[PDB]
Write a protein that binds this ligand. Structure first.
Ligand code: CHL
Ligand code: CLA
Ligand code: CLA
Ligand code: CLA
Ligand code: CLA
Ligand code: CLA
Ligand code: CLA
Ligand code: LHG
Ligand code: LUT
Ligand code: LUT
Ligand code: RRX
Lengths: 194, 210, 217, 165
């Protein structure tokens, strides 16, 4: 196991010890059945990877001075052209949905046709960082932990944006400037009475 | 049903109160402690409410006592019920959020030790730091008792604690009542009553408003 | 054996071991609507749903209303909150009601199928793996899994007590909402206003003086 | 509004009929004294007529070319133009009371059918049983739906006598 989410509590018997990121956290008993645990495991790894990509993209776009993550698709709401790294792109919203739909449908269909594979390897690992299965368990733990942190970070991004209006980088600078005066308790919607 | 002290000499006290809990006087006319699990929970609730009320009464009486003398500091003339709308270094909302997170951590740790005694005595960061194995819920000890005062008569000290806690709980209830009726701080009410107790009673003061 | 009428003959259908296992059994059934065990089970489910819905609604009416009396909130009256909420809203009441009916119909149909066949919602390969958590407990109307996240239903010693605190409170809430309607048709003010008006003068401000509840006086 | 009718509060024939009724009542009252029994009775009848006309106009009834109120029996029109109090609500009220009576009678027949002499109970009514069933009949729709769902409401075809065809 990776640890104990609640110190003093006993780990559930339905969570295998060799499972990466197994902290024994399952109070709702969602993964009680083995068939559900497999799908939820693959879903969690996929969610972590997508969240890592999303958080990295949002942080990079706001740190490079190209707006925040919320104002990215605003060009197709009032008329405009999308720009990547300051370079104009001539693809309109209609051509983007079709190409993304076809590409994502083909890639996801190929991935799902394998029978729910979480660690394919081979072509997806050209550098061979996980060639040996001894060090594979350690890196898998880092991947699932970074993915969980990224999922929490993306949820925080959405919540803080819907609560204040600024982006993640702008919210961090404001909190660094005034920690006691700017936090979730001073937005006006998290705490209603105060 | 023994020679233990009673709240009514001669009365037939209930049998579920055998003196195991501190300050047992057989006082339960509503029979709220009939269920053993309910009584076990109420003991911890009484201990927590008593300790918080003791801290509250001390924190209400000490600033007013120091304000009536030459001692001065920023918040002196402000009453205990008026301290909320005071200008501090941080807004009340921020302090409320910070304290809610900190109290969430300590209260969940306390609840974990309550449902499983001895399961929260280990420090999560420093594995070497820990509390002694012999412990009971509501009485942590260890770092919470650095002077080792519990090494003596633990029964007498527990009785003193529960008695002082009950007195402080009644004192806080009296603080709320006096602030709602007289609309003045408790020490001022005490001084007003000490000036002439025959004409300054709850009956006289409440009859003057009827 | 607690009874709703000391000395009255408790019905035989409410004295069976199966009926006595229900929470809040006080032998109250003068019309005899629960004589049929199947009907009794269905009515038990209906009473549980009514208790929970009434508790949520009465809480949503009383707590914001009590906070509005003080300076904590400014929530309007329950009989006028719908118009105020729909005024500065993003959707009309019809579209909102349609979306609500669809979302509520899905979960109500799942609950109905579970009532008809207990544990039938755990059919493998039917709810994206979440069907394992959709199986209720051994008692109808008391499911676990996603519901009850704190796990307070695992302790049996307090279980029988917990259910007694859910039905009774619910019954009280069911009466509260009823009063909320009657008072609205007899005084024209909110429940907190009626409570304050009665506390100011109970010997002259009650249902015997509203001119509606006693038309013969 | 509906069917080319006009509301009674705006119909001229409605007010004309009210004036005609009050006129004949006043004409009959003109032959009596001012503090006698026929005068008080006629004045009470006049007040009742005025109250009835005002209450019918206040209810939102539709009047025809004759100035008399017209009822709407279609549920759609009644619920769309506020006429459900004419034929809809009284329909459900009658259904409740009629089913109440029928259910109480059926329960009494089923209860006395298992005795020694059911005919004796049919001619000499058992007042305690009838009163108990009459009070218990308040939940007749729920009980009837439950009886229909359990299959105990109807009798099998093999237990009912028929002609030789
Ligand atoms: C046991 C705790 C506790 C008690 C008894 C009181 C009691 C009181 N506080 Mg208070 N407070 C308490 C905790 C806290 N307060 C505040 C922050 C404030 C503020 C900012 C203010 C008060 C005020 C008040 C008073 C009026 C209450 C009110 O506004 O009601 C309305 C709300 C409800 C009835 C709910 C007073 C009676 C007010 C005051 O000073 O009034 C003179 C005021 O302005 N409190 C915080 C955040 C740090 C608290 C705890 O964390
Ligand atoms: C949707 C993403 C997702 C999924 C599919 C999983 C799936 C899984 N997690 Mg994981 N987890 C996640 C996110 C997710 N997790 C995040 C973001 C964190 C960081 C907080 C964690 C932290 C975590 C720990 C510490 C552990 C797990 C564990 C597990 C496994 C145990 C089985 C189980 O508990 O039921 C399956 C879980 C689900 C089906 C997720 C249900 C989704 C609910 C509805 C989310 C509700 C949140 C709510 C909607 C928040 C939004 C607010 C709202 C107002 C918008 C399982 C395979 C345990 C394990 O053994 O690891 C292998 C364990 O130790 N997780
Ligand atoms: C758990 C009990 C309790 C609680 C909830 C409070 C709460 C409070 N106290 Mg208090 N106090 C307490 C116990 C308590 N006290 C006790 C036991 C004593 C005696 C030592 C004091 C002596 C005391 C003084 C002298 C003052 C307060 C003040 C205050 C207020 C602001 C505190 C502050 O500035 O930040 C925390 C401060 C530090 C961390 C340092 C605040 C509402 C101040 C006040 O009256 O507000 C204007 C103030 O002047 N307290
Ligand atoms: C720690 C308990 C305690 C103490 C020492 C006091 C003391 C005082 N109260 Mg008070 N009070 C209390 C609790 C207490 N109260 C409680 C629980 C309430 C209900 C919310 C009230 C409500 C109240 C009102 C409305 C008023 C007072 C007032 C007063 C003051 C003078 C008149 C009087 O005594 O009225 C009578 C007090 C009571 C009837 C309280 C009952 C007795 C308590 C429970 C103590 C039990 C006695 C016990 C043996 C301890 C003895 C004292 C001990 C420290 C040596 C006085 C200094 C008056 C005032 O403010 O003066 C201007 C006033 O009008 N009190
Ligand atoms: C089944 C019970 C029920 C129902 C039908 C309603 C219905 C309503 N409430 Mg209410 N409420 C309830 C329970 C209920 N409430 C409870 C138990 C509380 C706590 C005491 C509240 C507290 C409350 C407040 C303070 C307010 C309302 C308001 C409203 C009205 C606006 C609709 C709305 O809020 O947008 C839709 C709301 C959502 C889609 C949920 C948003 C998420 C919230 C903000 C966070 C809570 C998290 C939780 C998991 C959900 C509406 C008529 C508002 C009003 O009066 O309008 C003028 C308002 O001010 N409610
Ligand atoms: C006993 C036989 C009976 C008869 C002869 C009628 C006859 C009529 N009904 Mg009706 N109705 C009945 C029973 C009956 N109803 C019952 C038992 C119910 C309760 C379920 C209803 C509930 C009902 C509603 C809600 C409506 C009607 C309406 C109508 C009128 C036109 C619709 C139609 O002919 O289709 C037969 C009626 C139905 C199949 C019920 C559904 C309504 C259909 C879908 C038409 C509605 C579309 C629209 C409103 C048509 C009018 C367009 C424009 C003039 C506004 C028509 C005169 C409509 C009307 O004119 O409103 C004033 C109307 O909306 N009825
Ligand atoms: C237990 C009483 C009872 C019940 C439940 C029914 C029920 C029924 N009758 Mg029936 N009927 C009754 C008594 C009853 N009848 C009596 C006493 C007579 C002699 C006057 C008739 C003569 C009769 C005829 C000629 C017909 C029906 C028909 C029908 C069926 C159509 C609905 C209807 O109301 O028709 C109308 C029924 C009536 C007009 C008579 C009702 C008499 C009163 C209201 C019933 C009260 C009985 C009793 C005094 C109350 C119980 C007292 C007890 C508690 C002590 C229906 C199932 C029709 C049919 O054949 O089915 C398709 C039909 O053609 N009934
Ligand atoms: C006040 C709380 C009352 C209270 O709890 O007292 C305490 C006492 C409770 O006694 P127990 O519950 O321990 O009863 C067991 C035996 O000891 C009975 O004596 O009640 C009585 O004394 C009974 C007499 C009724 C007292 C009547 C009140 C005054 C009457 C006015 C006329
Ligand atoms: C485990 C469990 C079990 C037990 O039993 C119970 C409970 C408690 C229920 C649990 C828990 C749960 C949880 C926590 C969950 C959560 C999740 C999440 C958060 C997810 C996210 C997740 C998230 C995600 C994916 C995200 C992603 C993102 C993305 C893609 C983004 C994208 C983008 C970008 C780049 C930027 C631009 O400008 C825009 C866009 C284009 C938009
Ligand atoms: C048992 C029996 C049997 C025998 O044999 C006979 C007899 C006697 C008949 C009986 C009795 C009966 C009864 C009493 C009944 C009743 C019930 C009820 C009342 C219900 C309610 C129930 C109720 C309910 C659910 C309610 C609910 C509520 C709600 C949701 C609310 C909501 C809301 C809110 C929040 C706020 C806003 O602003 C508005 C609204 C929107 C409005
Ligand atoms: C429970 C009960 C009794 C049993 C009654 C039974 C068995 C009734 C069976 C009825 C059956 C098998 C079929 C009934 C079909 C009914 C039909 C087709 C009527 C449809 C209604 C229509 C078309 C419209 C009606 C109207 C509405 C709703 C409102 C207004 O009325 C105006 C109008 C006419 C438009 C027992 C045992 C005598 C005991 C006692 C009460």
């Amino acid at each position: 196991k990776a640890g104990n989410w609640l110190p003093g509590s006993d780990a559930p018997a339905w969570l295998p010890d060799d499972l990466p990121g197994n902290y024994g956290f399952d109070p709702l008993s969602l993964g009680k059945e083995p068939a559900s645990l497999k799908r939820f495991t693959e879903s969690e790894v996929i969610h972590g990877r997508w969240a890592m990509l999303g958080v990295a993209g949002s942080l990079a776009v706001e740190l490079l001075g190209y707006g925040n993550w919320y104002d990215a698709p605003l060009w197709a709401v009032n008329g405009g052209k999308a720009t990547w790294f300051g370079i104009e792109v001539p693809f309109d919203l209609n051509a983007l949905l079709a190409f993304e739909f076809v590409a994502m449908a083909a890639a996801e269909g190929q991935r799902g046709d394998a029978g729910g594979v979480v660690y394919p390897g081979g072509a997806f690992d050209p550098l061979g960082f996980a060639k040996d299965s001894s060090k594979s368990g350690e890196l898998k733990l880092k991947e699932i932990k970074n993915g969980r942190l990224a999922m929490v970070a993306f949820l925080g991004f959405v919540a803080q944006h819907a609560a204040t209006g600024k982006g993640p980088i702008a919210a961090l600078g404001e909190h660094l400037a005034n920690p006691w005066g700017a936090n979730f308790a001073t937005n006006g919607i998290s705490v209603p009475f105060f | 049903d023994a020679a233990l002290p009673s709240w009514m000499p001669g009365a037939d006290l209930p049998g579920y109160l055998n003196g195991t809990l501190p300050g047992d006087f057989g006082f339960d006319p509503l029979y709220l402690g009939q269920d053993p699990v309910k009584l076990k929970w109420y003991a911890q609730a009484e201990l927590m409410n008593a300790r918080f009320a003791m801290l509250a009464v001390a924190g209400i009486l000490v600033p007013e006592l120091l304000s009536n003398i030459g001692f001065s500091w920023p918040g002196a003339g402000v009453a205990w019920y008026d301290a909320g709308k005071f200008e501090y270094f941080a807004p009340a909302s921020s302090l409320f959020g910070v304290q809610m997170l900190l109290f969430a951590w300590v209260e969940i740790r306390r609840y974990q030790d309550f449902v499983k005694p001895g399961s929260a005595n280990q420090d999560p960061i420093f594995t070497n730091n820990k509390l002694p194995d012999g412990n009971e819920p509501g009485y942590p000890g260890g770092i919470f008792d650095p002077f080792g005062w519990s090494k003596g008569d633990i029964k007498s000290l527990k009785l003193k604690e529960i008695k002082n806690g009950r007195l402080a709980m009644l004192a806080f209830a009296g603080f709320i009542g006096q602030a709602y009726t007289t609309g003045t701080t408790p020490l001022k009410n005490l001084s007003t009553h000490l000036a002439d107790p025959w004409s300054t009673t709850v009956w006289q003061n409440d009859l003057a408003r009827l | 054996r607690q009874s709703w009428l000391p000395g009255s003959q408790i019905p035989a259908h409410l004295d069976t071991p199966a009926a006595q296992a229900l929470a809040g059994n006080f032998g109250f059934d003068p019309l005899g609507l629960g004589k049929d065990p199947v009907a009794l089970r269905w009515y038990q489910q209906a009473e549980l749903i009514h208790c929970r819905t009434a508790m949520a609604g009465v809480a949503g009416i009383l707590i914001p209303g009590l906070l509005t009396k003080a300076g904590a909130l400014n929530v309007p009256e329950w009989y006028d909150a719908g118009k105020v909420a729909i005024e500065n809203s993003f959707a009309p009441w019809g579209s909102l009601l349609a979306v609500q009916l669809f979302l509520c119909g899905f979960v109500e149909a799942k609950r109905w199928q579970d009532i008809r066949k207990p544990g039938s919602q755990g059919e493998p390969g039917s709810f994206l793996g979440f069907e394992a958590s959709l199986k209720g407990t051994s008692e109808l109307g008391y499911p676990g899994g996603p519901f009850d996240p704190l796990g307070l239903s695992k302790e049996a010693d307090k279980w029988a007590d917990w259910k007694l605190k859910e039905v009774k409170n619910g019954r009280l809430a069911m009466l509260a909402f009823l009063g909320f309607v009657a008072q609205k048709y007899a005084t024209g003010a909110g429940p907190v206003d009626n409570l304050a008006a009665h506390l100011k003068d109970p010997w002259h401000v009650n249902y015997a003086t509203n001119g509606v509840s006693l038309p013969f006086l | 509004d509906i069917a080319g009718l006009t509301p009674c509060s705006e119909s001229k024939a409605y007010a004309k009929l009210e004036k005609k009724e009050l006129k004949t009542l006043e004409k009959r009252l003109k032959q009596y004294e001012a503090d006698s029994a026929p005068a008080v009775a006629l004045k009470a009848t006049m007040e009742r007529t005025k109250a009835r006309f005002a209450n019918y106009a206040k209810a939102g009834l539709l009047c025809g070319n004759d100035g008399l109120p017209h009822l709407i029996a279609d549920p759609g029109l009644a619920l769309k133009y506020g006429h459900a109090g004419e034929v809809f609500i009284p329909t459900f009220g009658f259904l409740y009371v009629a089913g109440y009576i029928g259910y109480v009678g059926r329960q009494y027949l089923i209860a006395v059918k298992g005795e020694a002499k059911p005919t004796d109970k049919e001619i000499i009514i058992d007042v305690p049983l009838a009163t108990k069933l009459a009070w218990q009949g308040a939940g007749w729709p729920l009980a009837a739906v439950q009886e229909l769902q359990r299959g105990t409401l109807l009798e099998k075809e093999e237990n009912i006598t028929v002609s030789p065809r």
